[PDB]
Tab-separated table of C-alpha atoms in Angstrom:
chain	number	residue	atom	x	y	z
A	1	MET	CA	72.506	-28.795	-153.952
A	2	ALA	CA	69.289	-26.791	-154.925
A	3	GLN	CA	68.936	-28.531	-158.411
A	4	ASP	CA	69.647	-31.979	-156.673
A	5	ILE	CA	66.969	-31.167	-153.934
A	6	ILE	CA	64.468	-29.898	-156.667
A	7	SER	CA	65.290	-33.126	-158.718
A	8	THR	CA	64.890	-35.366	-155.535
A	9	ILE	CA	61.560	-33.656	-154.459
A	10	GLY	CA	60.235	-33.779	-158.125
A	11	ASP	CA	61.230	-37.565	-158.074
A	12	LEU	CA	59.217	-38.044	-154.750
A	13	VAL	CA	56.321	-35.944	-156.350
A	14	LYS	CA	56.470	-38.192	-159.529
A	15	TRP	CA	56.850	-41.609	-157.711
A	16	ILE	CA	55.443	-41.228	-154.105
A	17	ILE	CA	52.844	-38.372	-154.525
A	18	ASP	CA	51.491	-39.580	-157.965
A	19	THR	CA	51.273	-43.192	-156.446
A	20	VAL	CA	49.459	-41.693	-153.331
A	21	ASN	CA	47.031	-40.137	-155.999
A	22	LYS	CA	46.796	-43.470	-158.072
A	23	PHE	CA	45.025	-44.535	-154.783
A	24	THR	CA	43.669	-40.926	-154.042
A	25	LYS	CA	42.169	-40.128	-157.554
A	26	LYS	CA	38.526	-39.603	-156.184
């Protein structure tokens, strides 16, 4: 549960939030 939610949110940080910053470098 908590390690699977930390792993899932670190995967969204790595894929979705770093891709939102590949656009939003600025």
